[PDB]
Amino acid sequence: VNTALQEVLKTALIHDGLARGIREAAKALDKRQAHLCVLASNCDEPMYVKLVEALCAEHQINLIKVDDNKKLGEWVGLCKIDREGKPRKVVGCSCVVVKDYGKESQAKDVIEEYFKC
C-alpha cells in the first residue's frame, strides 16, 4: 500500500495538484478540498498535534499515520538537492495534503477499497 501511496504522491508532484504546506492545507480545508492527507504521529511537537488532529477530524478527511516529520521531506521533496544521491541540507514539514485530478490509476481500485472499507 506504501508503494501505491508513493506513486500517488509522485503523480501529484507531476501534475502539481497537491497543496504542500500547512497554509495551503488550511486553504484547502477552508475551500473544502481535502481528499487524502498524511499525519506524522509520535513526534516531539508539544501542542501542534492537537491542532492537526482537530483540523483532520472536521469533514471527510482520511486518517493516515506515519512515524516522523523529517522522513516526509523526501517524498514531497522540500529540499531534494543532489537528486543522484542523498541531500546534505534539508528541513522538515508536518503535513502535505494532495488534491489529485488524474485519479485513475492501477492500484487506485485497491486504494479506494481500503479507504471505503
Partner 1 sequence: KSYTTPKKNKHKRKKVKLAVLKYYKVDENGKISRLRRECPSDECGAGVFMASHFDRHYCGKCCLTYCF
Task: Kindly state whether residue 15 participates in binding partner 1, applying the rule CB under 8 A.
Answer: no
Q: Could you say which of 4, 5, 13, 26 contacts partner 1 (CB under 8 A)?
A: 26
CA nearest neighbour of 35 among 102, 84, 110, 107: 102
Kindly tell me which of 4 and 78 has the beta carbon lying closer to partner 1. 78
Decide whether 8 or 18 has the Cβ nearer to partner 1. Answer: 18
In 1-117 the beta strands, taken as DSSP E runs, fall at 19-20, 39-40, 65-66, 96-97
Shortest Å distance, C-beta 94 to partner 1: 10
Which runs of E-coded beta strand occur in 70-111? 96-97
Please list every residue from 37 through 66 that binds partner 1, using CB under 8 A: 47-48, 50-51, 54-55, 57-58
Q: Using an 8 Å Cβ cutoff, are 65 and 95 in contact?
A: no
- Give me the sign of the Cα torsion angle 46, 52, 57, 62: negative
Binding site for partner 1 (CB under 8 A): 22-23, 26-28, 30-31, 47-48, 50-51, 54-55, 57-58
